[PDB]
Amino acid sequence: KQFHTGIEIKVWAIACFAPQRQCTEVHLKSFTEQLRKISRDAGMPIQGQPCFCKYAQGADSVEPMFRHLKNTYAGLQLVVVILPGKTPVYAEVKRVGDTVLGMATQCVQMKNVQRTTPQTLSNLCLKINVKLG
């Protein structure tokens, strides 16, 4: 599909369902800094400072956390969700964001946050662009 310009992401959150011991804080800020630069260079800037960044565990944590976000940050445009490989967390993240609260969500694998590549960050910017485009 065609790329959309005029997109600016200012209020976004990070929900890390991957264990901290595997996907540490430096991994998160590094992944975020890289994402900021390439989304900037693509004309769809994502501000390098998320309004929220926390670790969580289990599908059951999803609804409470999303409800919390929705009630705390007005204008919240996106929730970047880090998953630890295949997990029911994904289904739940989608069930809650799509059919329950109307919240845009973008999932990404933990391995791609631990080790970023220009191609993966690119795939991400494209999926994100389609979603808020």
Ligand SMILES: C[n+]1cn([C@@H]2O[C@H](COP(=O)(O)OP(=O)(O)OP(=O)(O)OC[C@H]3O[C@@H](n4cnc5c(=O)[nH]c(N)nc54)[C@H](O)[C@@H]3O)[C@@H](O)[C@H]2O)c2nc(N)[nH]c(=O)c21
């Ligand atoms: C643990 N885990 C991680 N992933 C994660 O999935 C993430 C990104 O999701 P996403 O965050 O980018 O949002 P989505 O809406 O869901 O993708 P979405 O935008 O809905 O997909 C759109 C695709 O749907 C297809 N589609 C929709 N409408 C049509 C149509 O009319 N025709 C055709 N041919 N296809 C269509 C379309 O072709 C398009 O390719 C990755 O980072 C993985 O780590 C998992 N995925 C599955 N299925 N199961 C898991 O357990 C799992």
